Write a protein that binds this ligand. Sequence first.
Ligand SMILES: C[C@](O)(CS(=O)(=O)c1ccc(F)cc1)C(=O)Nc1ccc(C#N)c(C(F)(F)F)c1
Lengths: 239, 8
Amino acid sequence: PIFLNVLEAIEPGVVCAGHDNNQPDSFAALLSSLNELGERQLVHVVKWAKALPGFRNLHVDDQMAVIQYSLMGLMVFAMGWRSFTNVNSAMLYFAPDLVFNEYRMHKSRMYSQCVRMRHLSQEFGWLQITPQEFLCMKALLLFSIIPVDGLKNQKFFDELRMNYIKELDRIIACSRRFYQLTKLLDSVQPIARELHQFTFDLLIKSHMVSVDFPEMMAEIISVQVPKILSGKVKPIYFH
Amino acid sequence: DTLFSQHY
Ligand SMILES: C[C@](O)(CS(=O)(=O)c1ccc(F)cc1)C(=O)Nc1ccc(C#N)c(C(F)(F)F)c1
């Protein structure tokens, strides 16, 4: 199985947040670590994406755009899978050193979104999703959000997306399975959008609440994320 | 230009 060989080969390993677990769970502390973790995971997502079958076919600018637009959804989906496999969706396993219990969920002021992410993590159990299904679905999430006006080379993107859908169907090769996985994929987007809204608001008030953003995450939040919140860049839903 | 494009 060549395509699956490649996904398994390129899958990022463990990323720590650098969180100081001896300090008390404050909002500013938890946040500052999530932001640092997000940059660390983006560095890995970029190396991953660059190594995916056909990805280098995209215009370079379209490569960078799609990674930035899809980063949140990728991180949520992979986090839900880590949660499932590590702690049976009991808690949110952002990183080995940043595991959220309920108190954290509350302290982070992200409780409603945390609850949605835990529900997603449970879906992985409720659907019996396989490691191979996980890997194809995650590869497809990179190709699931685009400018309503299209990419620089939209034809190349559509052809890649089409082939990743086909790989997901070949890894299912029942039509019930496909309905359910496409539905699970769609459920990522509303969570990512709420996180993007929370993230943008947090960055605007970050000086007031003492939350630290690495420079590159600041730029992404101020340049890319408002395209999504303004409706210029939108998810491709199946349903 | 952009910090991301320079990372990329
Ligand atoms: C609050 C924030 O730190 C913002 S951020 O990571 O800087 C970010 C900034 C810009 C984006 F386009 C996407 C994400 C965040 O969402 N962190 C974060 C870090 C790790 C993981 C994981 N795993 C997640 C989540 F997706 F799982 F929620 C979220």
